[PDB]
């Protein structure tokens, strides 16, 4: 009844967690503010009536 | 002359003036790394800005 209680070990269990989207990680250079993006609108061919 | 005036002294006379100190002056400038990148669109313009 006079001894100090002895700890035995401390574990610190740990696992890291992934992303499930890490193949989308594209890397730009952090310059500018805005970024726009655009396609070409279609243009169907025409018959030609050369009169 | 008295010809023992050869023994007599002649010291220089030395006008002086004493000056104090100057003063230390300072100035600072803070450059950040994330929000000032929004408005240069190249890295070269950002380095020219910092310079």
PDB file of C-alpha atoms in Angstrom:
ATOM      1  CA  UNK A   1       0.000   0.000   0.000  1.00  0.00           C
ATOM      2  CA  UNK A   2       2.938   2.343  -0.531  1.00  0.00           C
ATOM      3  CA  UNK A   3       4.100   1.801  -4.115  1.00  0.00           C
ATOM      4  CA  UNK A   4       3.455   3.984  -7.089  1.00  0.00           C
ATOM      5  CA  UNK A   5       1.163   2.385  -9.694  1.00  0.00           C
ATOM      6  CA  UNK A   6       3.037   1.199 -12.756  1.00  0.00           C
ATOM      7  CA  UNK A   7       1.875   1.867 -16.286  1.00  0.00           C
ATOM      8  CA  UNK A   8       2.921  -0.821 -18.731  1.00  0.00           C
ATOM      9  CA  UNK A   9       2.689   0.701 -22.210  1.00  0.00           C
ATOM     10  CA  UNK A  10       0.980   3.433 -24.192  1.00  0.00           C
ATOM     11  CA  UNK A  11      -0.048   2.355 -27.637  1.00  0.00           C
ATOM     12  CA  UNK A  12      -0.927   5.352 -29.871  1.00  0.00           C
ATOM     13  CA  UNK A  13      -2.806   3.365 -32.463  1.00  0.00           C
ATOM     14  CA  UNK A  14      -3.096   5.217 -35.761  1.00  0.00           C
ATOM     15  CA  UNK A  15      -4.005   4.683 -39.399  1.00  0.00           C
ATOM     16  CA  UNK A  16      -3.949   7.162 -42.258  1.00  0.00           C
ATOM     17  CA  UNK A  17      -6.963   7.785 -44.469  1.00  0.00           C
ATOM     18  CA  UNK A  18      -6.929   8.206 -48.232  1.00  0.00           C
ATOM     19  CA  UNK A  19      -8.847  10.338 -50.679  1.00  0.00           C
ATOM     20  CA  UNK A  20     -10.727   8.113 -53.247  1.00  0.00           C
ATOM     21  CA  UNK A  21     -10.259  10.995 -55.736  1.00  0.00           C
ATOM     22  CA  UNK A  22      -6.522  11.470 -55.790  1.00  0.00           C
ATOM     23  CA  UNK A  23      -6.254  10.769 -59.510  1.00  0.00           C
ATOM     24  CA  UNK A  24      -8.125  14.020 -60.116  1.00  0.00           C
ATOM     25  CA  UNK A  25      -5.330  16.030 -58.488  1.00  0.00           C
ATOM     26  CA  UNK A  26      -4.171  18.356 -61.218  1.00  0.00           C
ATOM     27  CA  UNK A  27      -1.475  20.819 -60.238  1.00  0.00           C
ATOM     28  CA  UNK A  28      -1.427  24.419 -61.413  1.00  0.00           C
ATOM     29  CA  UNK A  29       0.880  27.247 -60.404  1.00  0.00           C
ATOM     30  CA  UNK A  30      -1.292  29.723 -58.384  1.00  0.00           C
ATOM     31  CA  UNK A  31      -1.278  32.778 -60.604  1.00  0.00           C
ATOM     32  CA  UNK A  32      -4.229  34.837 -61.731  1.00  0.00           C
ATOM     33  CA  UNK A  33      -7.691  34.799 -60.268  1.00  0.00           C
ATOM     34  CA  UNK A  34     -10.321  33.609 -62.739  1.00  0.00           C
ATOM     35  CA  UNK A  35     -10.463  30.854 -65.330  1.00  0.00           C
ATOM     36  CA  UNK A  36     -13.019  30.573 -68.092  1.00  0.00           C
ATOM     37  CA  UNK A  37     -13.714  27.772 -70.499  1.00  0.00           C
ATOM     38  CA  UNK A  38     -15.555  27.578 -73.762  1.00  0.00           C
ATOM     39  CA  UNK A  39     -16.426  25.355 -76.674  1.00  0.00           C
ATOM     40  CA  UNK A  40     -17.166  26.092 -80.306  1.00  0.00           C
ATOM     41  CA  UNK A  41     -20.830  26.181 -81.198  1.00  0.00           C
ATOM     42  CA  UNK A  42     -21.837  23.923 -84.066  1.00  0.00           C
ATOM     43  CA  UNK A  43     -22.368  24.959 -87.671  1.00  0.00           C
ATOM     44  CA  UNK A  44     -24.128  22.498 -89.956  1.00  0.00           C
ATOM     45  CA  UNK A  45     -23.253  22.450 -93.669  1.00  0.00           C
ATOM     46  CA  UNK A  46     -25.576  23.860 -96.276  1.00  0.00           C
ATOM     47  CA  UNK A  47     -26.720  22.838 -99.686  1.00  0.00           C
ATOM     48  CA  UNK A  48     -25.396  25.237-102.292  1.00  0.00           C
ATOM     49  CA  UNK A  49     -27.773  26.491-104.991  1.00  0.00           C
ATOM     50  CA  UNK A  50     -25.195  28.189-107.186  1.00  0.00           C
ATOM     51  CA  UNK A  51     -27.786  30.236-109.073  1.00  0.00           C
TER      52      UNK A  51
ATOM     53  CA  UNK B   1      65.595  91.051 -28.992  1.00  0.00           C
ATOM     54  CA  UNK B   2      65.631  89.665 -25.443  1.00  0.00           C
ATOM     55  CA  UNK B   3      67.112  86.503 -27.159  1.00  0.00           C
ATOM     56  CA  UNK B   4      65.730  84.252 -24.407  1.00  0.00           C
ATOM     57  CA  UNK B   5      62.349  84.413 -26.148  1.00  0.00           C
ATOM     58  CA  UNK B   6      63.727  81.429 -28.055  1.00  0.00           C
ATOM     59  CA  UNK B   7      62.876  79.524 -24.876  1.00  0.00           C
ATOM     60  CA  UNK B   8      59.287  80.851 -24.855  1.00  0.00           C
ATOM     61  CA  UNK B   9      56.350  78.713 -25.970  1.00  0.00           C
ATOM     62  CA  UNK B  10      53.706  79.081 -28.672  1.00  0.00           C
ATOM     63  CA  UNK B  11      50.878  76.602 -28.632  1.00  0.00           C
ATOM     64  CA  UNK B  12      48.247  76.157 -31.353  1.00  0.00           C
ATOM     65  CA  UNK B  13      44.779  77.302 -30.449  1.00  0.00           C
ATOM     66  CA  UNK B  14      42.160  74.787 -31.717  1.00  0.00           C
ATOM     67  CA  UNK B  15      38.586  75.998 -32.272  1.00  0.00           C
ATOM     68  CA  UNK B  16      36.254  72.989 -31.854  1.00  0.00           C
ATOM     69  CA  UNK B  17      32.575  72.025 -31.929  1.00  0.00           C
ATOM     70  CA  UNK B  18      30.895  68.900 -30.523  1.00  0.00           C
ATOM     71  CA  UNK B  19      28.045  67.127 -32.334  1.00  0.00           C
ATOM     72  CA  UNK B  20      25.478  64.711 -31.005  1.00  0.00           C
ATOM     73  CA  UNK B  21      24.122  61.600 -32.675  1.00  0.00           C
ATOM     74  CA  UNK B  22      21.880  60.913 -35.623  1.00  0.00           C
ATOM     75  CA  UNK B  23      18.706  58.866 -35.537  1.00  0.00           C
ATOM     76  CA  UNK B  24      17.896  55.362 -36.730  1.00  0.00           C
ATOM     77  CA  UNK B  25      14.993  55.246 -39.161  1.00  0.00           C
ATOM     78  CA  UNK B  26      12.940  52.290 -40.300  1.00  0.00           C
ATOM     79  CA  UNK B  27      10.184  51.171 -42.630  1.00  0.00           C
ATOM     80  CA  UNK B  28       8.523  47.831 -43.301  1.00  0.00           C
ATOM     81  CA  UNK B  29       6.452  46.221 -46.018  1.00  0.00           C
ATOM     82  CA  UNK B  30       4.279  43.127 -45.789  1.00  0.00           C
ATOM     83  CA  UNK B  31       3.981  40.803 -48.781  1.00  0.00           C
ATOM     84  CA  UNK B  32       1.647  37.834 -48.578  1.00  0.00           C
ATOM     85  CA  UNK B  33       1.630  34.687 -50.637  1.00  0.00           C
ATOM     86  CA  UNK B  34      -1.948  33.720 -51.412  1.00  0.00           C
ATOM     87  CA  UNK B  35      -4.263  36.669 -51.991  1.00  0.00           C
ATOM     88  CA  UNK B  36      -1.862  38.864 -53.881  1.00  0.00           C
ATOM     89  CA  UNK B  37      -1.436  36.050 -56.409  1.00  0.00           C
ATOM     90  CA  UNK B  38      -4.968  36.673 -57.684  1.00  0.00           C
ATOM     91  CA  UNK B  39      -4.062  39.677 -59.818  1.00  0.00           C
ATOM     92  CA  UNK B  40      -0.848  39.124 -61.773  1.00  0.00           C
ATOM     93  CA  UNK B  41      -1.507  36.132 -64.171  1.00  0.00           C
ATOM     94  CA  UNK B  42       2.250  35.338 -64.412  1.00  0.00           C
ATOM     95  CA  UNK B  43       4.958  34.600 -61.877  1.00  0.00           C
ATOM     96  CA  UNK B  44       7.221  37.174 -63.507  1.00  0.00           C
ATOM     97  CA  UNK B  45       4.811  40.025 -62.780  1.00  0.00           C
ATOM     98  CA  UNK B  46       4.503  38.878 -59.163  1.00  0.00           C
ATOM     99  CA  UNK B  47       8.282  38.870 -58.734  1.00  0.00           C
ATOM    100  CA  UNK B  48       8.478  42.275 -60.432  1.00  0.00           C
ATOM    101  CA  UNK B  49       5.843  43.490 -57.972  1.00  0.00           C
ATOM    102  CA  UNK B  50       7.785  42.165 -54.976  1.00  0.00           C
ATOM    103  CA  UNK B  51      10.898  43.850 -56.336  1.00  0.00           C
TER     104      UNK B  51
END
